Design a protein around this nucleic acid. Structure first.
Lengths: 36, 146, 329, 94, 277, 222, 50
RNA sequence: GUGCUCGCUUCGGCAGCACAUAUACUAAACGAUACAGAGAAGAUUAGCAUGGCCCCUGCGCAAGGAUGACACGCAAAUUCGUGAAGCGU
RNA sequence: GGCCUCCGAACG
RNA sequence: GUAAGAGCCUCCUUGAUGAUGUCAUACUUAUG
């Protein structure tokens, strides 16, 4: 492509730039693997 | 059988002969065949997906977010290469006739450069494949008339 | 990539140019027209009173004076036209004539004197040229142009007469009736519109989605009906207008229209109507029987039109086509 | 069929082979193959039609009709072995 | 990721300072944004530029600036019509051409700039284009840029500014510079002019030597027609090819005159006497 | 030159831009020209920012040069900025900006009469509004990015032009039901095509009318 | 009149109208066959009145 | 070329240092106009929808331009009965 | 003993 | 009462008539 970038619009502003990893208090993947 | 490869042919087709109609033997228990490669394959594949998604997400996410990118760049880009392997009369330079290649001046306050906004939606076709299906039985008079 | 300092010395040596590498009548063809022209016939004219003198207009942009009827030979040559003549006209006596040239130049022509009259011009290319009936003076001539306004032009006064727009379509032809209070005006809009003319206001307009263009327009010598052949090859006979209806004679089909305007002909015995065909064949029609006569192919090229003798009894009908003309008995 | 009516018919036959490489559908492949073989290329058309019909799935009316047309063409010797292979692929009383 | 930049527009200087441009003007053919590189081959010559995009340069397979024919260094039109016939659809509806070009380049996985060269087997047009090409025609290909101000004497700067005086030429025939720039692939052009200018029973052939034998000349001349006999003279290093019919003697005659390269060695062939001498 | 460049880009000539920040329909164009003129949102916003901008600009220019002002310069500064700055040419494109900011200007009037009250007052008694000029300056500090991407995307879309179909469906209101009926007839066509193993091709298209309308009058009627 | 677009298909002057792609049979370029198809193609179209 | 250093021998002569490859993208649809006026089975109109080889207004995935305008029914192929004429080892 | 929502511009 | 559009600044075909004016009624107008 290397084209079709000209102007922006609303709702496209930077949002949720930092994701949220699973905490050990909520869900742990290893604890789910060893889960009873 | 190679006539089915006419047109664009690169890697994945996997239909030429009809030997793929019926499967091979039956389900068996094998570690490499019936499960997956090692964990290093998913690790290197995930890292490669992070590099490709990092470059594509960096270009698309950078252009979609007018943070004005950076100042310019530093590609002094000294280019030593054969001029299309010309072999012209006498010599147009010394050795491969290297040239100095730097970046371009930045963009001024005026956004417009070349405006298109034209319409050319779709227009390429797609290569047809074989049917690769077991022909069934017709409906005759009763099921078709039903 | 190499060093930038070495590239500066290489450029400095390059600027120094251092290269170092170290029970119907059956008329037949009588006689061919007098002389002729290589280009197609632009218009077909004839002397109204005498009938022997015919003025042939061709695409060669040279007016051809012809003597025709009896002891058959033409008249003389006439020049002075800037471009191909779009239309031809003549006075009531015949000693004077008018010319409509696609150069957008209307030039009157004197004939019997051996040379023309004078050269004139108009605003646009005139699409129609016709003499003024009724009063024998007729200082103005009824004409039309691509400007889509039927306009009479006073001539002998040094300037024209008046201009009036009947319809938005370019007027194809204009033929004034004997009442002098109305002039039939056929335009490229396909709408046949009579026009009150001497008064700046016109008359009326009718049939825009009918009577395609104006391939043929003519009126009976008695003035009871005026028929117009249309580019669908459909001849629409219109009962002439004095009435509440004031239109509509009958329907006459069987002709052929290639899109080129063809001069309409008839046998005014209260009998026949005969015109050319778009394919070039000779179209013979019985009229008063509401049905035609016969189709007899004559010219080998596209038929330009046809003419008729005066009205006494059955005599003969002249014919003409593109590049050549042939008269029939 | 529109390209077959043309005076060339070479690109129409090659287009029929392109349809053979395309979805056979077991209808236009055997019907169009019978049309091309009936047009020309007897030994060749029956060879590619026998290889294609012997590739993906067997047939019944198309296989029996193909063995009948190949048998009535010149000799029934090859049609006997082809009939034994097709009958051996799908045995039955018929 | 440089442009095409063939050897004709590169110049005689080994080192060249080029300035790339990320977003330039749209291509005259592909009608798409691309990179515009600028360089000056000559000292006092004006800087060059490339108006052809990557798709525009890849479609015609020509230099991005000079836009010559292929890599042979000839005019585009003539050599393109000499290749096979045409094999192009520049005509109209670039929207329909953008699909054939986008699917073209996107579907083509084999390409490159210059990690390659030659690797062909002879050619049909290599002799005509080779005889129709010169050695580095770089004369007056960049700088002059004729100016009307100096012709009328109204230019105040004069030679100090670009467009040096006495640049223009008689406005009669093509200008050899902007004339080919008016159209692109449309005109017959001095491509066709210089193409027609470039096109214009026994046969003696000299320059044979020990490398060329009688079987090579008999097999080469036998393709035109039946040969009556052949006289191989090793002392004079010549051979006389006698044919039964003078038809093939005229064909191979004209086609054999300074066109004959046998085993990579040119041969000078003159028509036989046939005067009974 | 900014507004003259905006009207200069797309040829209009249906009105004139006035450095008073007033564009008027000289030729009095209407109909297709009325629908083609507009310029009442972003151009009116730039007419407000240039209205107060050029307003105080020419105000200080008249102060410094030409007619002497001094105490009158601070007078019309604070006063005219407060009442006149509260009205001026902003209006529409401001909305809550000049609404809450206009109430802040009313508080600046309460500070005006507050500071100078007892001994005397009549007219523009100064009490400089530069604090309220910092208020409205903060309204331009928040709105300056908003109008910055507004004029950036609008001006960028002016020379570029309207793109192709941008999707943007499901407008709710009564349009959500139409998309639910169309999408309902969509999967019904796929499942209808999957109902018969062979059947016919064109015969399935006509069934959408009989089943569609049959369900319409069916459920809608008794 | 103005050549851009029109009352007909855009740019359409029915010579190579719309993409025709291309076809090859097997690993070869057919020449005389296409020339014969073009000769019979010109033989199908004839000037006349109908 | 300038500035500096007698660096070498004349005030000027010679030598060394510092300043060291700019310009180019340099210079030469919408106006105006005649026309006629607007879909949903008898008369009037709400509107919202679907695909572009159609767009403008509108910062805008808000929305607005008479429901913003453009937008009709072809089928890949047969099978059996009756009468008349000609031919038949 | 006090408390005072109010606050308009286009399009259609 | 009005959104939109247009352009001009070298060879053939199946034979059904017409002109003298007025009422109930139907449709089209921003003039009531």
């Amino acid at each position: 492509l290397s084209q079709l970038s000209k102007q922006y619009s609303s709702r496209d502003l930077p949002s949720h730039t930092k994701i949220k990893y699973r905490q050990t208090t909520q869900d742990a993947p290893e604890e789910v693997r060893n889960r009873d | 059988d190679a006539i089915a490869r006419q047109g664009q042919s690169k890697d994945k087709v996997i239909y030429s002969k009809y030997t793929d109609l019926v499967p091979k033997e039956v389900m068996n228990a094998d570690d490499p065949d019936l499960q997956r490669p090692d964990e290093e394959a998913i690790k290197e594949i995930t890292e490669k997906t992070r590099v490709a998604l990092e470059k594509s997400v960096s270009q698309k996410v950078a252009a979609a977010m007018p943070v004005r990118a950076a100042d310019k760049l530093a590609p002094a880009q000294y280019i030593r290469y054969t001029p299309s392997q010309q072999g012209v009369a006498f010599n147009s330079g010394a050795k491969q006739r290297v040239i100095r290649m730097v970046e371009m001046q930045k963009d001024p306050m005026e956004p417009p450069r070349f405006k298109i906004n034209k319409k050319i939606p779709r227009g390429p076709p797609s290569p047809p494949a074989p049917v690769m299906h077991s022909p069934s039985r017709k409906m005759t008079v009763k099921e078709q008339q039903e | 990539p190499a060093h930038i300092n070495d590239f500066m010395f290489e450029q400095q040596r390059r600027t120094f140019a251092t290269y170092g590498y170290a029970k119907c009548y059956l008329p037949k063809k009588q006689i061919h027209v007098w002389s002729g022209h290589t280009k197609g016939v632009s218009a077909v004219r004839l002397f109204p009173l005498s009938g022997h003198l015919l003025l042939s207009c061709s695409m060669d942009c040279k007016i051809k004076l012809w003597e025709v009827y009896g002891e058959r030979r033409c008249l003389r040559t006439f020049i002075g036209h800037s471009k191909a003549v779009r239309d031809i006209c003549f006075n009531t006596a015949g000693t004077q004539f008018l010319s409509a040239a696609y150069d957008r130049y209307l030039k009157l022509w004197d004939t019997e004197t051996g040379q023309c009259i004078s050269r004139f011009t108009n605003r646009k290319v005139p699409y129609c040229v016709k003499f003024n009936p009724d009063e024998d003076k007729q200082n103005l001539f009824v004409a039309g142009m691509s400007d889509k306004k039927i306009v009479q032009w006073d001539i002998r006064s040094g300037e024209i007469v008046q201009e009036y727009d009947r319809h938005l379509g370019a007027v194809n032809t204009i033929v004034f009736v004997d009442e002098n209070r109305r002039f039939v005006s056929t335009s490229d809009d396909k709408s046949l519109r009579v026009w009150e003319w001497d008064i700046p206001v016109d008359f009326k307009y009718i049939a825009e989605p009918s009577m395609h263009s104006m391939p043929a327009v003519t009126l009976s010598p008695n003035g009871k009906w005026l028929a117009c052949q249309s580019m669908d090859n459909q001849i629409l006979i219109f009962g002439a207008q004095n009435r509440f209806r004031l239109n509509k004679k009958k329907i006459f089909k069987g002709h052929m229209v290639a899109g080129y305007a063809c001069q309409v002909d008839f046998s005014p015995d209260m009998s026949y109507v005969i015109s050319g065909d778009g394919n070039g064949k000779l179209n013979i029609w019985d009229w008063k029987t509401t049905k035609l006569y016969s189709r007899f192919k004559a010219h080998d090229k596209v038929c330009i039109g046809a003419v008729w003798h005066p009205h006494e009894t059955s005599k003969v009908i002249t014919c003409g086509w593109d590049g050549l003309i042939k008269l029939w008995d | 069929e529109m390209e077959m009516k043309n005076r060339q018919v070479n690109h129409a036959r090659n287009i029929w082979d392109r349809a053979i490489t395309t979805l056979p559908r077991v209808n236009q492949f055997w019907y169009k193959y019978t049309y091309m073989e009936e047009m020309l290329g007897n030994v060749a058309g029956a060879r590619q039609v026998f290889e294609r019909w012997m590739e993906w799935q067997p047939e019944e009316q198309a296989w029996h009709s193909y063995i009948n047309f190949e048998l009535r063409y010149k000799e029934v010797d090859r049609a006997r072995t082809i009939y034994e292979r097709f009958v051996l692929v799908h045995p039955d009383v018929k | 990721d440089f442009p095409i930049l063939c050897q004709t527009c590169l110049g005689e200087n080994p080192y060249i300072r080029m300035t790339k441009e990320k977003y330039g003007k749209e291509c005259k053919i592909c009608a798409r944004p691309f990179t515009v590189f600028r360089w000056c081959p000559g000292v006092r010559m004006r800087f060059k530029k490339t108006e052809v995009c990557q798709t525009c340069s890849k479609l015609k397979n020509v230099c991005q600036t000079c836009l010559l024919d292929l890599e042979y260094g000839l005019p585009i039109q003539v050599r393109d019509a000499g290749l096979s016939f045409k094999d192009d659809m520049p005509k109209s509806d670039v929207n329909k051409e953008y699909y054939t070009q986008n699917m073209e380049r996107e579907i083509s996985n084999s390409d490159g700039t210059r990690p390659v060269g030659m690797l062909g087997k002879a050619t049909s047009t290599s002799d005509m284009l080779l005889k129709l090409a010169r050695t580095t025609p770089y004369y007056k290909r960049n700088r002059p840029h004729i100016c009307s101000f100096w012709v009328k004497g109204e230019c105040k700067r004069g030679e100090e500014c670009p467009y040096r005086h006495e640049k223009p030429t008689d406005p009669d025939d093509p200008l050899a510079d902007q004339n080919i720039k008016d159209r692109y692939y449309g005109i017959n052009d001095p491509v066709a002019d210089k193409l027609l200018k470039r096109a214009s029973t026994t046969l003696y052939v000299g320059g044979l030597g020990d490398t060329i034998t009688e079987t090579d000349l008999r097999n080469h001349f036998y393709q035109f027609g039946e040969i009556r006999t052949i006289t191989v003279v090793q002392r004079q290093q010549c051979a006389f090819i006698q044919f039964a019919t003078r038809q093939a003697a005229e064909v191979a005659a004209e086609k054999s005159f300074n066109k004959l390269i046998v085993n990579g060695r040119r041969l000078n062939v003159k028509w036989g006497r046939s005067q009974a001498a | 030159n900014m507004l003259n460049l905006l009207i200069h880009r797309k040829n209009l000539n249906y009105l004139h831009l006035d450095y008073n920040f007033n564009l008027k329909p000289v030729k009095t164009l209407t109909t297709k020209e009325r629908k083609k003129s507009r310029f009442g949102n972003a151009f009116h916003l730039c007419r407000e920012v240039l209205r107060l901008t050029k307003l105080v600009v020419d105000s200080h220019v008249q102060y410094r040069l030409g007619n002497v002002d001094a105490f009158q310069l601070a007078d019309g500064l604070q006063y005219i900025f407060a009442h006149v700055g509260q009205l001026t040419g902003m209006y529409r494109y401001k909305y809550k900006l000049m609404r809450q900011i206009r109430m802040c200007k009313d508080l600046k009037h309460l500070i005006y009469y507050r500071f100078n009250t007892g001994p005397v007052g009549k007219g523009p008694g100064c009490g400089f509004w530069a604090a309220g000029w910092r208020v409205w300056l903060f309204f331009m500090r928040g709105i300056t990015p908003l109008l910055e991407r507004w004029l950036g995307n609008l001006l960028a879309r002016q020379f570029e032009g309207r793109h192709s179909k941008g999707v943007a469906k499901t407008v709710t209101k009564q349009r959500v039901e139409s998309h639910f009926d169309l999408e309902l007839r969509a999967a019904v066509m796929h499942d209808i095509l999957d109902m018969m193993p062979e059947g016919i091709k064109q015969n399935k298209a006509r069934t959408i009318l009989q089943h569609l309308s049959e369900a319409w009058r069916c459920w809608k009627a008794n | 009149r103005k050549r851009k677009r029109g009352v007909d298909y855009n740019a359409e002057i029915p010579f190579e109208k719309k993409p025709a792609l291309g076809f090859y049979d097997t690993s070869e370029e057919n020449y005389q066959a296409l020339d014969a198809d073009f000769r019979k193609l010109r033989q199908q179209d004839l000037d006349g009145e109908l």
